[model samples]
Target: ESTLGAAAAQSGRYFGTAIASGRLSDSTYTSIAGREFNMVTAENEMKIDATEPQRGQFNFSSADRVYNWAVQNGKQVRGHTLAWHSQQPGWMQSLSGSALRQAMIDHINGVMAHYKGKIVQWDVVNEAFADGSSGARRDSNLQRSGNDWIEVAFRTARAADPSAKLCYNDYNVENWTWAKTQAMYNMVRDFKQRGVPIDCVGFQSHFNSGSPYNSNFRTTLQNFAALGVDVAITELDIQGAPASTYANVTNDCLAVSRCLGITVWGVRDSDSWRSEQTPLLFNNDGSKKAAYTAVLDALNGG
Candidate 1:
């Protein structure tokens, strides 16, 4: 098969990429994204500021664009996120305590209710834990809201979209030894023991020269799967000549039964959030880079 999705499907998994709604008009971007991947994530189109920028008023044009494109192209949609501390409206930032908690619940329920059956999974709570010190949660208003805000978001999402898988997504959680990994593991274990309604956990695998890359990556995926939740490489991108890195990641995911799939953060380097380093599988000219070959080979059982 010429496509990554076709190769990955042979093993019963999906290969996805993040899409910017504005880029939907670019024929090259749309053609490559639809042909190469089986799934699509609405980059910033489904976020708090994008959807519900004003308290009760919601705007879904941008998000709806993404959904319509994915549907037309026959791609499964992974709802990028429902709640994150960043990129939210100022009104969300100004509130605190139960007021904020209620707002959080309302945001999740409202957003999720709109997508309902269209989304394969909702990144219900994102980046709640801080890096470096695993035990510390980020000091967002939701974490400080006196209540378990992540729990509330997930619960609300489940009620709103009972069909979609609920995922807790974060960065720097790929290696088992990292503090963030431990914190996420502990949280997921507790969720399993307590029935927190979580269906999966996502590790945003954005690798760079200085970032942590451990041989225990496979073990980490294994353990998270053991916790009774699927693990996904949500936002994956690596530095130059990333074939080796992509190969190892894809091989490890294949070894684990619970590894849901891998989603490249963006279709091409120029469109990436970290484009300065060219961290993606395709070049700006719409050609496959070395990383694409490695991932395809791995998915095809190399």
Candidate 2:
């Protein structure tokens, strides 16, 4: 029943979108329509600024709206980033100490409780690594909680919606570039050692096209899987100067297809989050690019 070589056709294939208003444009639908993906990740669909309670008032409208769209579209959604350093509201700076902790807990409960059965998986904690080392670094809010908030978030998520798989999602595991990747590896290993409720580890395979995509990407992924945990190539997209030629497109496809589940940043080059980077399967003109054909061929070959 699966389409050969298509990411959607593979159990490990998936895509992501920065869906707003819980709606997909006609163009987006056209680009990926009928292609089967294993999962779909939401970008900024759920963020602290977007979901946090407004003056003690909780709003599930934005998130629920997206969840509805995902169901209607027959695509699975990965609950992105329960807690992260970036994208948090500015007001959070005001609450110091316990008040801050209480507020975060409330926010987590609010969002996780609302989307229980609908969201199949989640990035419970996102990019929490303070570089790839346990060495001294910025003890940010989430990190300052000494891992309590993370545990609480996962626990609350499980309690609210036991069906959803919880993941510790982050970028930079591809090449083991900096201290951050190492830091995440330690966290995942620790979570496993202590019997934590963690389920999956999402590697946001934001690769650099034309280069060795990631140095130790596969090794780290296999290592994580060896830990008896599920691993997914979450938010995958290659960024560089505009890739306008067919050869460039083919190279892009080969680079991305190497991962487990490769998701284009957007359907079209111009539609990408990085407008300047122009990362997508199709070019601005809507013509079939080499990358698109290569992706199809890869999926078919797979």
Candidate 3:
């Protein structure tokens, strides 16, 4: 009956789990602190693109509370995102260019400035590229903002908090042939060569363990590493395809460990980002899964 907290302490670094939207008692933070996760995401505590719980006004009371908690606890922070197409508040849709840019900058500057040096990374743009199109995909923000959003956000973020590492976080490059990944690669390479303020690339590693890694996985990492950028497996979760077992979990975990750092979506399967798609890591009671053990073992170099 060793505690997860005690185990996490023994490990060099731990990713803290979170509960952002609701009021967490001191006991809750205590349990989290006991685990000693060196870094913590806001969990669900933050509302994505919505400025307010209701309308035009912004209410970060909830997220701010979480940041304060993390600060008080001595954990490094990884700001989840600044621009994700999914989370934009409904009212902002009609605005573009200066209007949209200002709103985005306001949010980015406000959040980053509040935490400033405390937050280590800010996902400046999330999943902004499409796989097979050298051009931005019409289905995503590329279509919405014509690829201008990334530049604006990254620039604004750097201006607000130069110390925070600016990152472009994305998924779906595993296949490699997608025009999307190529464009992303080109973008980052050019930016670095020209001395753009970009700092890192976060690969969302949610995948099936036994499935062949999108073939380009290593090559992309190798290429990105060549650009002198830090890499992180920002959101990794293994999903079983209707039928899965311990073997499958082990295969996936090992395959993904090749990346810099692996952060599972949540501490419990029931709380997964895609809980409806496939459960991950922990049982409802928080018992460990084979995949969880596999992840630790792999990261531990076992």
Candidate 4:
């Protein structure tokens, strides 16, 4: 009952970790991932490339492996994405106009339909806004289609599963980076004004070792929630951080009414994308690090 998941449950919030399908073989990794977290996001198995590598050929083998494991082990799955600019198949690169729109629809419909009622949230569209470009939308084929590709993705996803929470996910917009944050706020606000079928927004909190602490982090989450949608720390990882940083993130979300949950990017530092940086709450060999205690204590109201 003292585990991270149980601590968060006291506040009616879920603590999650991004789980790798490949690591399902590692007993130690699976043990912590299954017990410490109540929710699991497939690290990569549910992406476009893993699901539909070729045009219409759907392969849910890898994704199913991860999803089934989570359910059997008492963890709910957070579908990492239905559409993204990265990890796309080469065939989807040449699409445009209705073909491109249809491609997105096909992808979402197929994948979302596959796990319709199982997933609690779906990253409907990912990293749509380009980084450091004044919050401009990314220039992938999703953008080249002339029409509003994002709106399309969210709509299709909602239709596929009316119950799952549909979210727009991105990085670098967690803090008050005026331009970028405002742009996100505007879009979410507009989504509300126009009935865009959006249920949440995900802030991928990928912080660096020396990144300055921000007083605006919680404010930003509250501000976004003010727009009538939920806010969540979707993919969080901080390299070279002290226990305070982890505790700060935990306490901030707890202060916000609509901040649903937090999902660490990796189960352990060794599984992190920036492994050398040690950004996660656990060290290698399945041990709890200080960061883990920080978050647990915060959730337990220490």
Q: Highest lDDT among the candidates is held by which one?
A: 1
Residue 56 displacement in candidate 3 (angstroms)? 7.0
Arrange candidates by lDDT, descending: 1, 4, 2, 3
Candidate 4 error regions (>4 Å)? 209-213
Model 1 spans with C-alpha error above 4 angstroms: none
Q: What is candidate 2's lDDT per residue for 76-124, written digit by digit as tens?
A: 7878767777787777655656777777777777778777777877788
TM-score of every candidate relative to the true structure: 0.98, 0.81, 0.79, 0.97
Q: Where does the lowest 10-residue lDDT sum fall in candidate 3?
A: 241-250
lDDT of 4 by residue, 64-95 (tens): 99889988988888998988888988888778
Residue 168's lDDT in candidate 2: 81
Candidate 1 lDDT, tens digit per residue, 80-138?
78878998888898988989888888988888888879899889989999878646898
Q: Which 10-residue window in model 2 sums to the lowest lDDT?
A: 242-251
Query: In what order do the candidates fall by TM-score, top score first?
Result: 1, 4, 2, 3
Local distance difference test, each candidate: 0.89, 0.62, 0.61, 0.87
Winning model by TM-score = 1
Q: Report the lDDT tens digits of candidate 3 across residue range 197-253.
A: 888887776676533345456666667767788766566565652223333333333
Q: Kindly report which residue stretches of model 3 are placed more than 4 angstroms away from their true locations once superposed.
A: 1-19, 23-36, 47-56, 72-74, 131-135, 138-143, 175-177, 209-216, 241-260
